[PDB]
Every structure is written in C-alpha cells, then in structure tokens.
Amino acid sequence: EKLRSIVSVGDPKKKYTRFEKIGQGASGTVYTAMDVATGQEVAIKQMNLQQQPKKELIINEILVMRENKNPNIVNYLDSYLVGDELWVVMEYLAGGSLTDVVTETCMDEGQIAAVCRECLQALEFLHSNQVIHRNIKSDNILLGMDGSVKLTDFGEQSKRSEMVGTPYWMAPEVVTRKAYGPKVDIWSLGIMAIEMIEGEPPYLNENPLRALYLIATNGTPELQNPEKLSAIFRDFLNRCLEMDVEKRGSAKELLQHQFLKIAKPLSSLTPLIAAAKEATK
C-alpha cells in the first residue's frame, strides 16, 4: 500500500510502445520503449516482486529517487505495478556510455574537463543529501545525444569469496575495508579521468588481489605517460587522488578547480558519440 502510494495508476502497456529488451540486471529485465503521446524514449526495468527480499528497500530507494531529481542524474519518470511485477520507467539516454567513448576515441582535455564538471555537479548534489554513489566509473556515466552527461547505477561480498573482477575505481580507505564517506566518489572520479586520458581503466593487466594491494599502498595508479598531461590537469588529478581523506577535495571544492574552466561546451562530446557508434556497430 506504500507501493500503491508510490506507483502511478494506468496501463503502461498503453502509454508506451516499441519495447526492446536490452538485458537482465540482478534487479530485473530492462527494456527500451517510447512514450506513445510524446515520442520520448524511455528505459523500463521490470522486477518480479513476488518476491524479492528487502522489497521495502526497493520501495524506499525508488521513493527517494522520485523526490530528489537533478539534471546530472538519469531522471526517474514513473512506476507501475503490472501484475506482481514492478515496472520502473527512466528517461533513456541514447548516446551510450562513457566507456564506449573512452575506448573508441581519444578525448582531449577540454572534453575530459566538461565530463568531470558534469559529474562533479551530480556528486555535489548527492553528497549534500548524504548519498554515496560508490561506483563512479565510466560504464555508469550515460551520454545524451545533445552531449548531456548523467550518472546511473547508484543502487556486499564475503571475505570468504574470491574476487573475480578488479575494483579499480575504489579508494584506498574502501579497499582496506574501513568506514568511509563521500570522498570515495571523488577518488573514483580521479580514476575515471585517468581512464579518459589513457583510454582504458588502470590495473588492466593486474590480477585483482595485486590491484587491491597497489590501491591500498600506492594510492593512485602510475599514469602511463604523465609527461603527456597538462600541469593543470595533473593538479586536478592530484586533488582527487590524495590518500589523506581530509586533504582530498570535496565535490564543492573541486567544482572551483581551474582545470574545469578549460571545459568545452557539451556539444563537443557529440562527435565523440558519433565515433563510438560508428566504431561499435
């Protein structure tokens, strides 16, 4: 009844058309579709709630997401109960992910600065509401066809379990399993800016346990070609990748950094989107 006071009434099978499956997350199945009245493209996650545990957690997470929108977060539109399934409808960003741009183009520092600024705007908002994203990385940055930049995926593994993937975006204080705060996202942003300029995530050729150790002890990964970065970009990276949590910049502080002032207009990202789409098809 809290879900019924959270969802909308109506038939989403009538409001939307052209359903196309993308894939299946842990939550549920994800489709793209189009609003029959406005032509807006949407992404719809269908979740069988009969039954997933911590259902109230999904209800509350969706609750919070509906009341705290922001231009740099993928916009929540509506939810519907469709026969024991819960459908969550989000706006659809058709420009793909930042990962595709990073791997198929070489971004210049003005383009990187523009992405960093848009992400830092999102993080300032999240941190002001005491939200920690924890997975700031390129596959969680979605791009609009106008060059808009938005965060997604801000929604647990045993000591006894082996590590299969490398958590290359995680701050040293996360990796050493300490308590931590919003500035882990700033660290992750620094790592993503290195990814943008090098074209691949750091530690790519490392086993996860070796990378875990390097993160805890070295902190920043060694830039492959540091001579290739401008002084102001290198300074920005140093402020994001400070091992001392107190010294590491906050999002509010870094929004004032001079590196962000070389940002190109966001229209400068749309040729990157075009290249990535040509390259991946």
Next chain:
Amino acid sequence: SDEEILEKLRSIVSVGDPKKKYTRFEKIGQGASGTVYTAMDVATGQEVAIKQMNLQQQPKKELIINEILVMRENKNPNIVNYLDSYLVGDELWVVMEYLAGGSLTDVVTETCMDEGQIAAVCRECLQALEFLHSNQVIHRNIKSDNILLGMDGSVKLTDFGFCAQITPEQSKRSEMVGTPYWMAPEVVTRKAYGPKVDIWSLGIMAIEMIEGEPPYLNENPLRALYLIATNGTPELQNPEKLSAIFRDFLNRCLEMDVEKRGSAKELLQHQFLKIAKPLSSLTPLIAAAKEATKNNHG
C-alpha cells in the same frame, strides 16, 4: 577479439534442449555466476545440479572455457563430476552431479570434528589432489567452501575457475590467484610456485576443521595477505589439543620450504590418515550442520 572468445566458448558446447533429458527444475541459488537448480535425469533418475548463465553478461569468458575444459578432461570420484552442457540461445547450461549434504564450510562452522573425521576428509581431498597434480592441474582455490559432501559422507572438490594447467616448459606460476586466507606464502609474495600451493591450502582447511576458521579471518583480506607474507607458517590457538601425529601432518602441509612440504602422493602415506574413520562418520556432522542452518535462519 571478444566476439571470437565468445564464439570459442559457444563452439565447445552442444546446442540442444536441457528439458529433453532433465525435469523437475527447482531453484536452489542465484548469484553472479548465474542461477543454480536441482533437476533429475528423466531416464535414470539421477539428481543433478544445473547452472544457467547469460554469456553476453559474463566477463572473462576465457575463464568459463578453461573451467569447462578442465572438468571434462579430469573426471575423478573425488571431484564433483561434469555431466553435460547445452547452448540455448544466449543461455549456457552446465550440468553437474548433485551432492545433497552441503559444504564442508557448514560442518566446520557449526560442529566439532574429531581427528578421525578430519583424517577422513583430508584423505579424500588428497586423493583428488594427487589425481589433479599428476594431470598437471593446480586447483589454487582449495577451501572448505569448495568441498561438497554427499549424504553418504562422500567428499568432492569443486570450483575449478581459478585452476592452472602447467607444462614441463612452464612448470610454475607466479600470479596472486586464490582466496587470501588460504593462499600459500609463495603465491602471496609472487614467487614461482607449483602444485604444492594446494597442499598449503589443504593445511589451512585442516585448521578450519580444528578451529572453525582459517587464520586471520577477522582481518580484512589485504591485512591477511600481509600477515601470511610476514608470519609464514601460521600458529594454532591451542596446539596442545592435537595428537602428535596430527601436528606432524599439519607441519608437513604448512612447511615454508616448498621442497620440504609434502606432495599429495607423499601425504597419502602419512600416519595421520591411518586413524581416519569411515566416511559414514561424517553423516552425523552433515545432519548437525543442516539443523544449525535452520537455527541461524529462525
């Protein structure tokens, strides 16, 4: 590139319908590696475990290739047997024999094992490792979580996703692969290593059977790596509680000098194993572990 590693995986798996051969699919688990069911062979009544995976969503497909190939190529009564596999569109289904007695982890965390029961488990595990090492396969992820038990007390090794195949041209590995608390010091410190890293991990599993946990489990995984590198052979909480023969077996599994550490073939002759009880002795422990699991859930 990555489309041809996918095609390589698809090529090793036959296309067909798992319902042609198996029925009564009951979910028993869901995870990152896919979804796990029990099912039954329609013709023979054999109970099986079946994992369903979405290939397009799996990273490191080459590790799935290696796991399937190693299972197919190395069947043994002390290994959870690979039966079959099926390609259904984007889906891969892998069929394994089913062991209904849970894991050794449930036993070690909820029961006290006596030395005869411990010796029985060690012997069965050493039989698997002697077979694998003689086939130039290193498991590298031995731990109680990867020991499955049958309802008759049978003992079988699983989880070959981290295993390494060695050759006479490249007899050793040096990469940090495994689960920290069970890793041998030469692995943790990136020295050239061989099959006896599995003997080390078995020694750690014997400490689990003694104490309930591997050394340093309360520490974070990275700290445990540091402690393994710096301490070497771990200390028992109460060594005075073990027989002299058990202590000697443990010493020979946890030897720092890899040349002095026992091989699986050598340890199968150790006098500690001569006190092993029959495997039937493990079914009361399985029953206790099953009951304890109900207590923790209620």
